[PDB]
């Protein structure tokens, strides 16, 4: 699974997610990656999110939209919503993985509950950060 | 203000099994793609074009399980899925179970921009993309020795 | 108190074009199916079994655009989708783009119960269901003159 | 499109949706009906929902999950959430259709913004209500 989120100079948010799925998966199985609100979501009013992880649990929990709804309706910060979904709700359903998120205010979050997540981010005109492991 | 983030998959990425040289190949690939995104956003390109290009590059990168370097199914086949969403209009496009499209994220952008639909699957998705001039590829192009060995090992 | 609700689709249902007798066919079919569900709930059947049976019956009913009475695609084919979700476990199952399964909701329940997956599509969904003894049908069984005429009119 | 929602004597909610899709549709088109959180959702904490209508818009708005999130995070009643999604949000995106919903307390809602929705509901051991047209 791969993905990207961005906020542009016009204040527009977008998200994309693409995957090969799982080694040895049953032909015809669909994970969260192509499912609006599960593996991918963007709304200028809220957040853009791309997910990666145990797809079934990201579908059951509507992980990407759940971030948006927690912020929009619950008034959670990006960091608070990311903690709630990735560190609490997904593990409670036996899910592992992570996501990237940017909110309408340009806050960026790359939560994961796994050993690693291949990731990077950067502000326009600023130096990029890369990461593989925790910490 | 403008900002991009990307990922190449979350999972049990093992430090014990990696050399620094292997890790640097991932850092180099992530850095190159996030820098392309930053440059595009600095230049006033849209968030939708920035995420589409960043994902096409992660698909192109054989180090990541999307596009080239796609994992094998139980049947030693490739089935690829993608989605893109525009936070301005809340339009979305997605394909699932496509095997003959080099870049799934571009087929998903094609669904968003060149159909009234949000999600197309399988041979119908492929036929819709071919009717709009996207090229047919053999799913063989996605295959890498590395991913084929992870299938044999499983 | 246990309760069921069902639907057979929302849209431009025109009073001017209907007779009472035509309307009553729909009312009778909805009443029969909601009554089956009520009786099942009264008897202590699970919400999951009640919604699966209510949807199987709405599929079986040719008056409704699911299962028998499915609308035609551009190519005069039938492609059927379905989903079921259990609010207790939050498990779900779903199929999309299936043509050779008489009861999509039962195949969606098969995905939930006999796989670790939530969603299967197309030929792989069908092969998964056939490997578990679900019967293969010709999509011709779904075809009704009423829906075929809405396609001809749509063109 | 058809669907059903139910609350049983054990207090468990469930939902199912099944469809042929849209007359003359492109082969391969998926609407909301098989998408968890779009056409179908259930959660004992909130609601069971089955939707019917213009599938594309029900996917973009995550209609079924949005009912739950509006109740759970936004503190809306079933009636308030149903009004918000079916009568305000879906028409704003050019969506038409409706849904059925039962909440964990057994409140029932059958909102639609169309001329009709084939529908019925009933409490166990009671006589059911049927409807085609608007009230
Ligand atoms: Cl070294
Ligand atoms: Cl009469
Ligand atoms: Na790749
Ligand atoms: Na039917």
Author numbering:
A (entry chain BBB), D (entry chain DDD): 179 to 313
B (entry chain AAA): 3 to 156
C (entry chain CCC): 3 to 157
Task: Quote the study's own text.
l-Asparaginases hydrolyze l-asparagine to l-aspartic acid and ammonia. The prototypic class 2 enzyme is EcAIII from E. coli. The same Thr179 acts as the nucleophile in the autoproteolytic maturation and in l-asparagine hydrolysis.
Arg207 and Gly233 are responsible for the anchoring of the α-carboxyl group, while Thr230 and Thr179 stabilize the γ-carboxyl group of the substrate or product. More significant changes were visible in the region of substitutions at positions 206 and 207. In the WT protein, the side chain of Arg207 is responsible for presenting the substrate molecule to the nucleophilic warhead and for maintaining the pattern of hydrogen-bond connections in the active site. The isomorphism of WT EcAIII and the mature variants (space group P212121) greatly facilitated comparisons of the structures.
